Design a protein around this nucleic acid. Structure first.
Length: 692
RNA sequence: UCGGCGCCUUUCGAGGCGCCGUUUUUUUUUUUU
């Protein structure tokens, strides 16, 4: 039996007086008996122990708590906002009136389902339904039942496959993967051979004779932006960034606008993509495909060879892109400055231009982008880059064949510098035009509480890093380690440790925050930032397109209050967090399937934590973090000692032959060991075990 | 996250309830998909 909720008037009175504390619940995944909310006063979190103490609140709910008398313990007494999807994936068992549902997630409780929802052959023959995934939605949880009451949605398929588990994590996280109704496709233009209307040749600047190109990955269906560079007659360059004009095709108030607003970010998975607009807009009219006339919104600068701004112009234009490069052709043209590249390895080009113009254009943009990068990192930019893996999937069956490591070459930096310049320029324009309403991004500084713990950790172990600032933090991590096999692994382990206390970046509206100190982006060390570029994938990028066209005098001022923009910003934030979690879980699923169907995988590892009877490794080749126990090891003994706050584990192994003396192994932090990954009898679980 | 012990339900694939002994949760920024 749980405890009943309280009235709304008492909640409001105690929340305005200050006796009750609101906050977002966070639930430990590894152990499900404890939860934490952030304190408003100080840094350290408020403890909520047990399952009874938190009244029917799931992970992510925005709850209202009351502190227990005598780090600080509280109990949930009200729920303002229900932010959890109230859905789960799991298995059904015949415990009569009900049937039991056990979710895979251990934070979701156990669910009673009536036998009308259960299938027709479950009551007598339930043995074939012990490996079959079901989706169940909680509709009611009583105050006297330890089990929620649920409605069974459907049958996914066999557990351990690719598509049942994919649809399970999409439904559990709230991603709407359904189809578009006919009232949404009726707002699209109805002319299949679409052409530019002749009244749009006077309000826009015509750039159909320039050399404009796109650099995007080989597996790309939507192209948002294009670049151009031109050498001037006094040793300067005219650099232009061109973005697809999406807000011309999405009118305000139409059903397309509400549907696009409902799912803010597109979701990218390993095998497919859940879009935000219909296929017609995303892959035909809006996308900047080669040799077609497109309506764009563009920014043009005049830059010195070191990359300093002398002129600036915003405005609506009409372009025609000439080629579509990749991140691999651009790297070839970067790495071959004095030698002509043969036409066999190049994508097709419009006959108006030559490949020499594209070649010298990407060379000049590389020359400017190098100096912009160096100056930005002298000024104090911070960059904690971890390890990401990419898969090769078989075409017919859809199973993974092998994983490799995604490498950040120079062509990924060429684009990243010009996009960072266009975003900061547009942020300055729409902030000085409309101070009351503007959409901007902010990153708070990291938490002082566990930055002090990382400082006292690196005070030991002979590491001279410093965490006083952001540029100091980046220059210290780059200079101390250097380049070596043991050193690069040291860098990876410290990047994983340093990436832990950083906070998360937020969208916000400028009419609610009072001081300009909080408008600052911490990691990039700039005072204003906004996402003007790439609109097809995000909806805040279309809100910024409307604001900038109102500021330039092309239309009337926006009629939205400063609170409506804040509500839309909160929706875009939660959609971007759920999308990020979904992509991480999809990569983890495909790796577990690869380990099971590719035998044992042999690699090296670096210890990053040591406990009394177990230790955590980080597999260097794959980047996954697994825990190793001594019980699965054929060893005579192991001893744990603490020497100068530097733990030590000594393993005395068992000799295969009695005559040969038993070897010894000493394990401390930053030690290189060898591990093997082996699948086990459960469908999607594996383990890592030490070798020799 | 477990280690040990006791009990119950199994189609042997394992689950669930207690008693001790452990250990208080944060994985972020950038660009293109």
């Amino acid at each position: 039996i749980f405890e009943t909720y309280m009235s709304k008037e008492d909640v409001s009175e105690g929340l305005k007086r200050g006796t009750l504390i609101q906050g977002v619940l966070r639930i430990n995944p590894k152990k499900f008996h404890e939860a934490f909310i952030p304190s408003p006063d100080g840094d350290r979190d408020i403890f909520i122990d047990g399952v009874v103490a938190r009244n029917r609140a799931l992970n992510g709910d925005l709850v209202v708590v009351k502190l227990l008398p005598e780090q600080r313990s509280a109990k949930v007494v009200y729920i303002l906002e229900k932010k959890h999807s109230r859905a789960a994936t799991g298995f059904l068992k015949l415990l009569r009136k009900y049937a039991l549902f056990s979710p895979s997630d251990h934070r979701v409780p156990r669910i009673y389902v009536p036998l009308k929802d259960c299938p027709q052959d479950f009551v007598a023959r339930p043995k074939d339904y012990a490996n079959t995934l079901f989706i169940c939605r909680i509709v009611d949880w009583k105050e006297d039942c330890n089990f929620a009451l649920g409605q069974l949605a459907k049958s996914l398929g066999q557990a351990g496959e690719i598509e049942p588990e994919t649809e399970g994590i999409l439904t559990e996280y709230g991603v709407d993967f359904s189809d578009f109704s006919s009232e949404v496709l009726e707002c699209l233009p109805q002319g299949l051979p679409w052409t530019i209307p002749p009244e749009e040749f006077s309000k826009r600047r015509d750039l159909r004779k320039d050399c404009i190109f796109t650099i995007d990955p080989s597996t790309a269906r939507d192209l948002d932006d294009a670049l151009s560079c031109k050498p001037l007659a006094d040793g300067n360059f005219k650099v232009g960034v061109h973005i697809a004009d999406v807000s011309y095709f999405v009118p305000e108030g139409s059903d397309l606008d509400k549907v696009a607003a409902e799912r803010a970010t597109s979701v990218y998975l390993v095998q497919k993509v859940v879009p935000m607009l219909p296929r017609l807009l995303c892959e035909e009219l809006c996308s900047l495909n080669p040799m077609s006339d497109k309506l764009t919104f563009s920014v043009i600068w005049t830059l010195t060879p070191e990359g300093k701004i002398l002129d600036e112009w915003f405005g609506r234009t009409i372009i025609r892109s000439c080629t579509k490069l990749s991140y691999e052709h651009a790297q070839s043209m970067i790495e071959s400055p004095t030698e002509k590249i043969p036409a066999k390895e190049l994508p097709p080009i419009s006959p108006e231009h030559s490949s020499e113009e594209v070649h010298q254009a990407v060379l000049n943009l590389h020359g400017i982008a190098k100096q912009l990068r160096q100056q930005r990192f002298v000024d104090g930019a911070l960059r904690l880059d971890q390890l990401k893996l990419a898969f090769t999937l078989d075409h017919e069956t859809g199973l993974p064949q092998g994983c490799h490591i995604y490498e950040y070459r120079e062509s990924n930096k060429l684009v990243e510098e010009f996009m960072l310049l266009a975003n900061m320029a547009v942020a300055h324009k729409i902030h000085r035009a409309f101070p009351e309403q503007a959409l901007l991004r902010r990153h708070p500084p990291p938490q002082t509480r566990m930055l002090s713990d990382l400082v006292e950790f690196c005070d030991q172990m002979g590491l001279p890093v410093d965490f006083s600032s952001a540029g100091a933090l980046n220059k210290s991590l780059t200079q101390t380690f250097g380049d070596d096999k043991y050193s690069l692994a040291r860098k990876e382990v410290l990047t994983n440790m340093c990436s832990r206390p950083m906070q998360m970046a937020l969208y916000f509206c400028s009419g609610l925050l009072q001081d300009p100190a909080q408008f600052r982006h911490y990691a990039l060390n700039v005072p204003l930032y906004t996402h003007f570029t790439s609109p097809i994938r995000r909806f805040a990028d279309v809100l910024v397109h409307r604001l900038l066209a109102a500021a330039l005098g092309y239309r009337e001022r926006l009629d939205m209050a400063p609170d409506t923009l804040q509500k839309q910003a909160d929706h875009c934030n939660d959609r971007r967090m759920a999308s990020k979690r979904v992509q991480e879980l999809s990569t983890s699923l495909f790796f577990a399937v690869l380990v099971k169907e590719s035998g044992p995988l042999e690699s090296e590892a670096m210890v990053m934590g040591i406990l009394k009877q177990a230790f955590d490794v980080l597999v260097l080749r794959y980047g996954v973090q697994k825990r190793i126990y001594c019980n699965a090891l054929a060893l005579r003994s192991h001893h744990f000692q603490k020497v100068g706050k530097k733990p030590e584990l000594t393993l005395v192994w068992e000799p295969e032959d009695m005559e040969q003396e038993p070897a010894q192994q000493v394990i401390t932090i930053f030690s290189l060991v060898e591990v093997v990954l082996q699948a086990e009898s459960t469908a999607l679980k594996y383990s890592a075990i030490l070798k020799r």
